[PDB]
Amino acid sequence: MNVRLCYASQRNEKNEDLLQDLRDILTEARDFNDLNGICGVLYYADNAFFQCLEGEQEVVERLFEKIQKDQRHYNIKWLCTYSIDEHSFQRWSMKYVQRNTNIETFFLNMGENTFNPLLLNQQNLKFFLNELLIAEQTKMNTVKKVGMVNR
């Protein structure tokens, strides 16, 4: 049973070094996800995250349980889990997308004046996931593998 799981979270503003945290998150995500057959997308803007995970239900659920404990974010808002009809984010172990004009236009047109994904509801994910799929990935210059960031 392949599923898609989506959540939004607040970035832990206590962590001053955002750039190192984002590079560390993507290094860890891409290595673990590639090994465990998970793909998806991570959006960051306005001190908040949106993530979608795709893959085998048990692995996705165990990964989400781990992410919920991560020091780097808090106030996790679980949006949905559902059986996948197509593997939309197959191309990325973990795609990274930041604020772009299409996403800013989406938020403003529905009456939000911030781009914080905690403001999204499940119906918005129709348009928002499509925007994350078509967005140019944001390049972040991450070390080649997770072993390089520890010991």
Ligand SMILES: Cc1cc2nc3c(=O)[nH]c(=O)nc-3n(C[C@H](O)[C@H](O)[C@H](O)COP(=O)(O)O)c2cc1C
């Ligand atoms: C916003 C956010 C997204 C994350 N996404 C992933 C992910 O997709 N895959 C992954 O393995 N870890 C992800 N992590 C990292 C995990 O929370 C955790 O640091 C990593 O799995 C290492 O766990 P360990 O302490 O058991 O080695 C994410 C963390 C944050 C804050």
